[PDB]
C-alpha cells in the first residue's frame, strides 16, 4: 500500500522545506548557504553548501556525525540510509544569503550601519556581480524606524528575466531595542557556459556579429586544385 503521486510530489517538498529551516537555525553562523538532496536507492545523500567547512564537521568530525543521527530520528530514516556531506560554495560574494548573514554579524558586533553596508557592497561588486542593493530597516536613530538603502550598478525589477538574473535574501537581526530587517539583492553577470550567472542572455540584448573583412575580386581567376 503506497501513496498517490499528487501527495508524493508534495510531501517531498514539505520535507525539503523543513530540513532547510532546521539547518538554517543550526549552521547559520557557520556560512550556511543551501542544501541539496540526492535520493540514491541505496543511500540518501544530503549535501550542505557552506563557507566555513571546518565549523560544519568540526574537530574529528564530531558535528556532522551528530547531524546525520539527529536527522534520521526526525524523518524516520533507517539507520545508515541517510548521509550528510559538507562542501564549499564556489563563490561567496554572489550568494545573497551568505551576504545577508555576513552583514547581520557586523550589525550584531558594533559596526556602524553606514560602514557595514558599504563593506558588503564593495565585496559584492569586486567578486563580479553586475549589481547590488542592500536595504536595512528598523530603529536605527531613536524610537522612530527608517530605512537606509545602498545601491550600486544595474538592477532589474520586472519580468521573467528577474527569476534567474537576481538572487534575493531577507533576514532578521535582533538588537537590544528591537528587530532590524536586512534585504540583499544581487544581479549576476551573464557568464556563458559558466557556474555563476545564468547561461541565458538578457531577453532584450542583441549581439550582432562583426563580419570578417574580405576583398571582392576585380578580375576572374580559376583555381584548378
Amino acid at each position: 500500500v503506497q501513496i498517490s503521486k499528487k501527495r508524493k510530489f508534495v510531501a517531498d517538498g514539505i520535507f525539503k522545506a523543513e530540513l532547510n529551516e532546521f539547518l538554517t537555525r543550526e549552521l547559520a553562523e557557520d556560512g550556511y548557504s543551501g542544501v541539496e538532496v540526492r535520493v540514491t536507492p541505496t543511500r540518501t545523500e544530503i549535501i550542505i553548501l557552506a563557507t566555513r567547512t571546518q565549523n560544519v564537521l568540526g574537530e574529528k568530525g564530531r558535528r556532522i556525525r551528530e547531524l546525520t543521527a539527529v536527522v534520521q530520528k526526525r524523518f524516520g530514516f533507517p539507520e545508515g540510509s541517510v548521509e550528510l556531506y559538507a562542501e564549499k560554495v564556489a563563490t561567496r560574494g554572489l550568494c545573497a544569503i551568505a551576504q545577508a548573514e555576513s552583514l547581520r554579524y557586523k550589525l550584531l558586533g558594533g559596526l556602524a550601519v553606514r560602514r557595514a553596508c558599504y563593506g558588503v557592497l564593495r565585496f559584492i561588486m569586486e567578486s563580479g556581480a553586475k549589481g547590488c542593493e542592500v536595504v536595512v530597516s528598523g530603529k536605527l536613530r531613536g524610537q522612530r524606524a527608517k530605512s537606509m538603502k545602498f545601491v550600486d550598478g544595474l538592477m532589474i525589477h520586472s519580468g521573467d528575466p528577474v527569476n534567474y538574473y537576481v538572487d534575493t535574501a531577507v533576514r532578521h537581526v535582533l538588537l537590544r531595542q528591537g528587530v532590524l530587517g536586512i534585504k540583499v539583492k544581487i544581479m549576476l553577470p551573464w557568464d556563458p557556459t559558466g557556474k555563476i550567472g545564468p547561461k541565458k542572455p538578457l531577453p532584450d540584448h542583441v549581439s550582432i556579429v562583426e563580419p570578417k573583412d574580405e576583398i571582392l575580386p576585380t578580375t576572374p581567376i580559376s583555381e584548378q586544385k
Partner: peptide, 30 residues
C-alpha cells in the same frame, strides 16, 4: 570600530545635535 562622523552628520544635521556633529566631522576631516 567606533562611530562614523559622516553618518552622524548626515543623520543629525537638522536636529539639536547639529552643532556638535559639524564639529566632529570637521575634526575628522582636518
Amino acid at each position: 570600530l567606533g562611530t562614523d562622523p559622516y553618518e552622524d552628520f548626515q543623520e543629525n544635521w537638522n536636529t539639536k545635535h547639529s552643532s556638535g556633529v559639524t564639529r566632529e566631522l570637521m575634526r575628522e576631516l582636518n
